Write a protein that binds this ligand. Structure first.
Ligand code: THP
Ligand code: CA
Length: 129
């Protein structure tokens, strides 16, 4: 897979962010994870976590996987990096997202994320508390 440039437009919630990509505004949904909705328990903490990560980043990158690049809503499906750190993984590692929505063909980082989830759960962090 390949990292490509993007710039933040605005944090939306734990697992959706608006970025400019190839010069066009696009809403991106993070591959392989599910954060709680803002209305749910840990939703506000997930939103805040993503928001801090993407806002503080000097460099945002997006990475498509091998499959569908957009979902049925027209959201981009990607891994997003903030100064080289994957948001999708970081959310999981901190118990603020579950590994989820694993579709065959767009699952390159599956086992990386599952490993993070196991550690978050060991530590009983947040969602796993
Ligand atoms: C993460 C992801 C979500 N989706 C779709 C499935 C879900 O459809 P439904 O809307 O019919 O439930 C929805 C979940 O996203 P959200 O968790 O943002 O709601 O997005 C994909 O199609 N591909 C993906 O890789
Ligand atoms: Ca969600």
């Amino acid at each position: 897979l390949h990292k490509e440039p993007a710039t933040l437009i605005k944090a939306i919630d734990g697992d959706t962010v608006k970025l400019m990509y190839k010069g066009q505004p696009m809403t991106f949904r993070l591959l392989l994870v599910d954060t709680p909705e803002f209305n749910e328990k840990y939703g506000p903490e997930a939103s805040a976590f993503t928001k801090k990560m993407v806002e503080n980043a000097k460099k945002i990158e997006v990475e498509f996987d091998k499959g569908q690049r957009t979902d049925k809503y027209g959201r981009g499906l990607d891994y997003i990096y903030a100064d080289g750190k994957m948001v999708n993984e970081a959310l999981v590692r901190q118990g603020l997202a579950k590994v989820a929505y694993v579709y065959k063909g767009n699952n390159t980082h599956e086992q990386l994320l599952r490993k993070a989830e196991a550690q978050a759960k060991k530590e009983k962090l947040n969602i796993w508390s």
